[PDB]
Amino acid sequence: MKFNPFVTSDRSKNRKRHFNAPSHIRRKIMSSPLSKELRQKYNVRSMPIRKDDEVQVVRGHYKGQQIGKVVQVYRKKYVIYIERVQREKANGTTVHVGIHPSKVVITRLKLDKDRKKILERKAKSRQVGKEK
Amino acid sequence: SELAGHQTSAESWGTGRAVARIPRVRGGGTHRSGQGAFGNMCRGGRMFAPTKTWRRWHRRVNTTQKRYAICSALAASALPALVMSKGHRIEEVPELPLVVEDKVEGYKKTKEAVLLLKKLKAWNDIKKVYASQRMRAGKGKMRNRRRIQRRGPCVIYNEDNGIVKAFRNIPGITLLNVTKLNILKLAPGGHVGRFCIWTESAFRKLDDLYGTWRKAASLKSNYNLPMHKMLNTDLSRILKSPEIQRALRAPRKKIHRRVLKKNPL
RNA sequence: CGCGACCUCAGAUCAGACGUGGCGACCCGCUGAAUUUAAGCAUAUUAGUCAGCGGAGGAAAAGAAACUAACCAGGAUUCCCUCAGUAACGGCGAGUGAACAGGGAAGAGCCCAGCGCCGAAUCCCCGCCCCGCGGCGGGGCGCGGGAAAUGUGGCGUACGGAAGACCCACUCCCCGGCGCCGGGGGGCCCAAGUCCUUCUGAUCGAGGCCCAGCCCGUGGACGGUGUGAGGCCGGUAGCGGCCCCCGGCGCGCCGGGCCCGGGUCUUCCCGGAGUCGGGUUGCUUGGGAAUGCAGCCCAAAGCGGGUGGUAAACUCCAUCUAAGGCUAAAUACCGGCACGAGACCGAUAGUCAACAAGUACCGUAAGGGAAAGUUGAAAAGAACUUUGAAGAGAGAGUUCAAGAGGGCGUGAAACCGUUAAGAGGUAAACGGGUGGGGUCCGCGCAGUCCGCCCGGAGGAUUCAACCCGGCGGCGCGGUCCGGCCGUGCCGGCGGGGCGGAUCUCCCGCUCCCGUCGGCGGGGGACCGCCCCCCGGCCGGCGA
RNA sequence: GACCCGUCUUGAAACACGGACCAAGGAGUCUAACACGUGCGCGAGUCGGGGGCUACGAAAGCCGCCGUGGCGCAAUGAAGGUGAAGGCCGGCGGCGCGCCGCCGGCCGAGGUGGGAUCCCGAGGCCUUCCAGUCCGCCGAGGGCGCACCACCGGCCCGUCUCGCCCGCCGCGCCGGGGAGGUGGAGCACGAGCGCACGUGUUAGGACCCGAAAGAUGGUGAACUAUGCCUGGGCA
RNA sequence: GAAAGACUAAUCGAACCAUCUAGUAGCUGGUUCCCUCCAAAGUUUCCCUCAGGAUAGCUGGCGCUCUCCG
RNA sequence: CGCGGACGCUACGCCGCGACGAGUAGGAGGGCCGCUGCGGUGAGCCUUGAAGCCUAGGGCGCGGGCCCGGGUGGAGCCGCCGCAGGUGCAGAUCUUGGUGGUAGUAGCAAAUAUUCAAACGAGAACUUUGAAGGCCGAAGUGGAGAAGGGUUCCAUGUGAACAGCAGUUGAACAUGGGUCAGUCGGUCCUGAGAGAUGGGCGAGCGCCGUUCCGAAGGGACGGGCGAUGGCCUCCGUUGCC
RNA sequence: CGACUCUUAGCGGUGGAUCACUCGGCUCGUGCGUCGAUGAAGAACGCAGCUAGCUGCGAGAAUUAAUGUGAAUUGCAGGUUGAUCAUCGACACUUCGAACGCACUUGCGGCCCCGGGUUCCUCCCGGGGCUACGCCUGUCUGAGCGUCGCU
Ligand SMILES: [Mg+2]
Ligand SMILES: [Mg+2]
Ligand SMILES: [Mg+2]
Ligand SMILES: [Mg+2]
Ligand SMILES: [Mg+2]
Ligand SMILES: [Mg+2]
Ligand SMILES: [Mg+2]
Ligand SMILES: [Mg+2]
Ligand SMILES: [Mg+2]
Ligand SMILES: [Mg+2]
Ligand SMILES: [Mg+2]
Ligand SMILES: [Mg+2]
Ligand SMILES: [Mg+2]
Ligand SMILES: [Mg+2]
Ligand SMILES: [Mg+2]
Ligand SMILES: [Mg+2]
Ligand SMILES: [Mg+2]
Ligand SMILES: [Mg+2]
Ligand SMILES: [Mg+2]
Ligand SMILES: [Mg+2]
Ligand SMILES: [Mg+2]
Ligand SMILES: [Mg+2]
Ligand SMILES: [Mg+2]
Ligand SMILES: [Mg+2]
Ligand SMILES: [Mg+2]
Ligand SMILES: [Mg+2]
Ligand SMILES: [Mg+2]
Ligand SMILES: [Mg+2]
Ligand SMILES: [Mg+2]
Ligand SMILES: [Mg+2]
Ligand SMILES: [Mg+2]
Ligand SMILES: [Mg+2]
Ligand SMILES: [Mg+2]
Ligand SMILES: [Mg+2]
Ligand SMILES: [Mg+2]
Ligand SMILES: [Mg+2]
Ligand SMILES: [Mg+2]
Ligand SMILES: [Mg+2]
Ligand SMILES: [Mg+2]
Ligand SMILES: [Mg+2]
Ligand SMILES: [Mg+2]
Ligand SMILES: [Mg+2]
Ligand SMILES: [Mg+2]
Ligand SMILES: [Mg+2]
Ligand SMILES: [Mg+2]
Ligand SMILES: [Mg+2]
Ligand SMILES: [Mg+2]
Ligand SMILES: [Mg+2]
Ligand SMILES: [Mg+2]
Ligand SMILES: [Mg+2]
Ligand SMILES: [Mg+2]
Ligand SMILES: [Mg+2]
Ligand SMILES: [Mg+2]
Ligand SMILES: [Mg+2]
Ligand SMILES: [Mg+2]
Ligand SMILES: [Mg+2]
Ligand SMILES: [Mg+2]
Ligand SMILES: [Mg+2]
Ligand SMILES: [Mg+2]
Ligand SMILES: [Mg+2]
Ligand SMILES: [Mg+2]
Ligand SMILES: [Mg+2]
Ligand SMILES: [Mg+2]
Ligand SMILES: [Mg+2]
Ligand SMILES: [Mg+2]
Ligand SMILES: [Mg+2]
Ligand SMILES: [Mg+2]
Ligand SMILES: [Mg+2]
Ligand SMILES: [Mg+2]
Ligand SMILES: [Mg+2]
Ligand SMILES: [Mg+2]
Ligand SMILES: [Mg+2]
Ligand SMILES: [Mg+2]
Ligand SMILES: [Mg+2]
Ligand SMILES: [Mg+2]
Ligand SMILES: [Mg+2]
Ligand SMILES: [Mg+2]
Ligand SMILES: [Mg+2]
Ligand SMILES: [Mg+2]
Ligand SMILES: [Mg+2]
Ligand SMILES: [Mg+2]
Ligand SMILES: [Mg+2]
Ligand SMILES: [Mg+2]
């Protein structure tokens, strides 16, 4: 249960800070799990997602064992757009299909200087509890 | 609030004008211009008896009835019929005043205390709790009363050596203390017979806290137990006894139904 | 008529400083009504209340006695319980209505004027330099200037005080610039299944993982995700970690400041003035031959003055020092910023207002003041053909669904349109009773079953009885050996705890000529109940 | 067979009134006090409501040298004030055997009439005719007699009438005592306290809707009423 | 106000807007689910009482002491 | 000899015998009648389809009402022992919405009046051009302004809304365009009157009052001193007297 | 054989009740308890590439600097040495308003000081600074046979 008395366990005060949440926390809410291939090596469980990653799809209609690529994140509807998940309108143009990021597993990353500072800290302060 | 309905300004149109002598809205060029403002039957306007906050919410009950209810809720967590009929799953427990050693206060892992409730064969109750996690009906869903469940077995210890962090996760399990007992978690809803798991250092304390009939309580001020009103409550071994079946009259159990009248002429 | 000086008084775009208006939930000062009740109504009550006016604060006010009580006497103010709906007022009708004592929260106390003594022992501002300076300060210098003898500072205030002697005692105290040792706000971070076959438009649902009961469980609160999730994400748990910032307070020095106290005896000094009080008129309060406040005239006194709840004199006792001042905590809070919860309402409800609401709109104004939620998981929001001047159609097409089509979930009745049936000259409608015609069900259309005997044919792994093994029940055994218990008990060389308005050598004080003696902190024995090991009677073992 | 429903009314089908039609909303509630019934605990006592101590929990549990305090156990008078049986017996004082009075031994908290239940128990309850134990029964009459009701007495305080003795650091306009009628919300071997529910009367907006008015504080002479300033018009 | 109780923002024998306010009424209308049991009064005295309330009456509910002499 | 004997009794239950039943205002009791919510409990039901509606479908109860089958619908719901309440409607000239009869009817009648041909056009009793016939008849149905309105003025397009019939037309809609000053006016003076300071009242926000209980001249003037600089000639620019 | 009128059912219209949801309100409670002459509250007028409204800001105008985060904003076009979103401590802040030169037409001025036509010399334009009432300690300048007396 929660014991801290300055944190709200209500329904509406948790839906409001979600549908009116700013972009720098939309960053954290729109994350996605890593594969067991990366979970073996980095010893990490979840990362925020970037425009140039690689993706399989587990649930939804378009699920399978295929590796797509991210086109562009759309953090206003909590949704992204992928390369080859698209479908046809009336006349023939192709419109992409929105996928929520929690249904999405990552197989390859987009590594930077601002990303390995993070990824080595989410296992440093991961192991301290192992040191219990 | 006190302001409901009265933050307008109204005055009736009087007689004539083919209306009902009701307070009406003072002019204006809109919809709400002569619509009906005060009263209770209007759209808008106050309710009957605007509920005040100084309704007498709380009650008090005497002391020596609070202690008589505790003695009358402890005396029925010992029969294996008032516990089964309450609803628990107690088909196999080997002894109903279940007293366990004092090394349970040294548990700190809930993993270490499920192996305990498996050995004690009480897990099929917690299994009934997992088999009865469901929603709620009505308008409780939008007032943070979403998920309900079913009340499980109680646990009564003596001193806190680490057991709370090792039991407070299993749903249903309600903890207590002997020094600071409670009724609302001994008699759920108003009914009697919740299953309980005592500890040795507590079950050896009720003789001192509540006292026998010929010895008062030594941690209270002045309190003996209450007195029964009749002893041989079983009138099946009273009535077919040789002292009573002798001094009765004969039992008259012949049915005597009404007779038809035939004509004697 | 001169130069001169204190006094009274003006001007300045003089130098540097200040206040003015707003919010108004709680607060202090004034001003202040009427509906209403009395079955009428005028004193009363409604009320020291709404409205009106002026002032503040994070809290305001009050306040260290000109006090209560008549006791063996208490001892600042505020706040809660209580006294109390009581003593008392009142066309003695309706009705209004206090305090003291007692138990509690909180606990804190003080300074000036006068009387007198120290050679104005006093401040503020300008000047120069050094240090520090986002709360303008300290030390050094100013033949550099100003206010004060119509009184600036020190000691000192009613619990008595001072002074001068004679004895006894003295070695810390306060800030300010710092160095230095270990409450607060923000940031980023921390467990575990998308495992099997399968339903679905889509699974979070249904089932499965034993001989460690899928995994972590100091984490099963909640929320998001195409229905319903401990294990998909975020999150919660934990004296868990890290990174910043400001302090509270502890220690070293380096600076300046201030030389102060007891006890015992001799001599001196000691208090607030158009106010107290008295008469009167008016409002007021429970205050009644007048509680307080305010106004007019009169107007004091030092072994004095006020109070001592019935006016007045003569008396005795008791208790306090008016007319001048300061002060934190205990208490209050429909406004304000920042937060948690709820046996509450769920769009004609709840604030007027869930949305471009004090907005649209009326009135010259003061002011009055609404209606209005919902596609679908995703716009994938209907390409193209065709008739038509166009609106709107007809095929096609998207989705699980247009039987969800841009005010699109559900789609109620009144009401209208059309179809099918059954009728119709005393307005229609109903009640009681049958009869006819329709819709429908019988999942009706060859109608019971269960026991038991006789008979007919069939077949088993087939009875009664003995033999071993296991369980269970009654036992009045007229009385098997063992047990525990007693809202049962007698005596005990027992080994012990709670009480007591039963009784009386030690420690102490005071008193007494180390001795008495009242007062107590203590023993120690006497009882009664309870506990505890050994010993005996009866007893149930059907709580 | 049969007038259309609600409503005041002695008297509705009425030539009495409100009502065209459907959906939603709509009217004896909330505190304080008191009275009586009823359920629960403790019981001559009861009650911690205010105060303290140790996620649900703003809950629960405790405290007795925290029981102060509230109601109750004792009434009456305007008040100063007073404040609830006595019978028998010893030697006994005067007088006129009795009273009263200083002292000793026993006794003792009323009486009559009804009164549910209770006890004694003359007499008998068969089974082949006579003894006799228990168990209750039955039972004429005869006894203790609860609760209560009627009545007689007695005691306590207030007040009037008649009249006698006793007490004492204070000796008096001191103090105390008796018998007899009258007034009292009183005793006469307790019955209350705290909580919860119900009806009823009330005070509060008080079952909901309804006036003609009354008061405080503010906004209007752009229409019209009159005086002003300044200009304009009448073949 | 050369006067009629005229006019004063369609309002005058005391304007309009907000507040005390949900002002008072012995006076008119309305007052929301079923069954079962019992069942009346419009008379008395007093009232600035005669459309109204107090009182006695009639009525219902809960029980009680006895019977199973009155 | 044989191993045999129905039902019952939720004691708040079951069974039997007798007489009786009207009923307004009003009183009481039982309600396995009902609504919205909370503690308890049903190892409840539910996308192989819950609430809610609809029904010439089948039935139970004295009744309040409930239950079932068959259709639509698409995500949360009920029963029992207890607790609490903003808890049950036909009416109040009731409140808020909504629809009928009356009805394709009352009505589109003040100021004398319209015809013929052509063009654009899907379309013309009203639109534009021309041809006649008539009215206002100089105190005008004409030409310009002030008060007020505020983009209506101008052009090009539109035709689903508005112009109480229609409409190619519009003071309607949508895009765009437009208002030029030394002399025209405001500005500048005073009028009837409004309104500050000195001063007076007033518990007070403030009020009467406007020359009245007031030290009300900030400026010119001519001359002399000290100043400065302008090509310091001629003078400016300031201070005092 | 019809038409009208009444009756019930199936279908379809008008209408927006019911059921289910909820970024809203109501009440209680905790901790804090902070405005303005250094120009508040309030109002007015402006600002977006395509813009009306609320909302956000002030000629630096749908935000600048810094730090923290470290790759988007979005209806359509665009073009890692730190985008965008937060925090906020450094800068700026148009006209009315206690409102402040005198007025409310935004109209009339004055005193200093710089730039220009010019050549301090007047006027001429532009730019900046000051010019409210009330009162306090000071400095300066003065009045008075009512002072009050000296020289
Ligand atoms: Mg925590
Ligand atoms: Mg409302
Ligand atoms: Mg519901
Ligand atoms: Mg100055
Ligand atoms: Mg007065
Ligand atoms: Mg009256
Ligand atoms: Mg009256
Ligand atoms: Mg009157
Ligand atoms: Mg009063
Ligand atoms: Mg008065
Ligand atoms: Mg007053
Ligand atoms: Mg007021
Ligand atoms: Mg102020
Ligand atoms: Mg403040
Ligand atoms: Mg103060
Ligand atoms: Mg003070
Ligand atoms: Mg004193
Ligand atoms: Mg006192
Ligand atoms: Mg009392
Ligand atoms: Mg009288
Ligand atoms: Mg006191
Ligand atoms: Mg304390
Ligand atoms: Mg001093
Ligand atoms: Mg002094
Ligand atoms: Mg996680
Ligand atoms: Mg979910
Ligand atoms: Mg769904
Ligand atoms: Mg979940
Ligand atoms: Mg699971
Ligand atoms: Mg008075
Ligand atoms: Mg005075
Ligand atoms: Mg007296
Ligand atoms: Mg005296
Ligand atoms: Mg004082
Ligand atoms: Mg809480
Ligand atoms: Mg409710
Ligand atoms: Mg609504
Ligand atoms: Mg609403
Ligand atoms: Mg709705
Ligand atoms: Mg709506
Ligand atoms: Mg909706
Ligand atoms: Mg569907
Ligand atoms: Mg629909
Ligand atoms: Mg039809
Ligand atoms: Mg027909
Ligand atoms: Mg007939
Ligand atoms: Mg009527
Ligand atoms: Mg009447
Ligand atoms: Mg009549
Ligand atoms: Mg009648
Ligand atoms: Mg009738
Ligand atoms: Mg009438
Ligand atoms: Mg009618
Ligand atoms: Mg309704
Ligand atoms: Mg009672
Ligand atoms: Mg009564
Ligand atoms: Mg009432
Ligand atoms: Mg009057
Ligand atoms: Mg005029
Ligand atoms: Mg005139
Ligand atoms: Mg005239
Ligand atoms: Mg007249
Ligand atoms: Mg009048
Ligand atoms: Mg009313
Ligand atoms: Mg009213
Ligand atoms: Mg009866
Ligand atoms: Mg009278
Ligand atoms: Mg009347
Ligand atoms: Mg009456
Ligand atoms: Mg009957
Ligand atoms: Mg039907
Ligand atoms: Mg849905
Ligand atoms: Mg209706
Ligand atoms: Mg016609
Ligand atoms: Mg003519
Ligand atoms: Mg013209
Ligand atoms: Mg013209
Ligand atoms: Mg045009
Ligand atoms: Mg002019
Ligand atoms: Mg004036
Ligand atoms: Mg724009
Ligand atoms: Mg940056
Ligand atoms: Mg002007």
Q: How far apart are CA A111 and CA A28, in angstroms?
A: 17
Q: What is the resolution of this structure in A?
A: 3.8
Disruptive mutation site among B144, B147, B168 for chain A (greatest number of A CBs within 10 Å): B144
Q: How far apart are CA B198 and CA B100, in angstroms?
A: 7
β-strand partners of B24: B11
Residues of A with CB under 8 A from a CB of B: 1, 9-11
Residue B247: partners with Cβ closer than 8 Å, 6 or more residues away: none
Of the candidates A103, A107, A61, A58, the residue with the CA atom closest to the CA atom of residue A78? A103
| Technique that determined the structure | cryo-EM
Taking CA–CA distances from B165, the nearest residue in chain A reads A1
Interface of B with A in 139-158 (CB under 8 A): 142, 144
Q: How far apart are CA B104 and CA B96, in angstroms?
A: 18
Q: How far apart are CA A53 and CA A73, in angstroms?
A: 11
- Ligand 71 center from residue B33 Cα (angstroms): 42
- C-alpha distances in Å from residue B46, one per residue of B1, B24, B26, B34, B151: 10, 15, 18, 17, 42
| DSSP-assigned states of every residue in chain A | ----TTS---SHHHHHHHHT--HHHHHHHSEEEBPHHHHHHT---EEE--TT-EEEE-SSTT-SS--EEB---BTTTTBB-BSS-EEE-SSS-EEE--B-GGGEEEEE----HHHHHHHTHHHHHHHTTTT-
The DSSP H or E segment spanning B252 is none
Beta strand pairing call for A104-108 and A54-57: antiparallel
Q: How many CB atoms lie within 10 A of CB A82?
A: 20
- C-alpha distances in Å from residue B2, one per residue of B5, B38, B43, B53, B56: 9, 13, 18, 11, 19
| DSSP-assigned states of every residue in B83-147 | TTTTT---SS-S-SSEEE-GGGTT---TTTTHHHHHHTT-HHHHHHHHTT-B---STTTTTT---
β-strand partners of A95: A87
DSSP state, residue B202: H
Q: How many CB atoms lie within 10 A of CB B88?
A: 20
Q: Let me know how long chain B is.
A: 265
> Angle CA(B92)–CA(B98)–CA(B99) in degrees, nearest 5?
145
Encoded tokens for A128? 């301290």
Q: Please, which contacts does B61-67 make with residues 24 or more away whose CB atoms are closer than 8 Å? A: B64/B223, B66/B183, B67/B223
Cβ-in-10-Å burial (0-12, 13-18, 19+) of B154 comes to buried
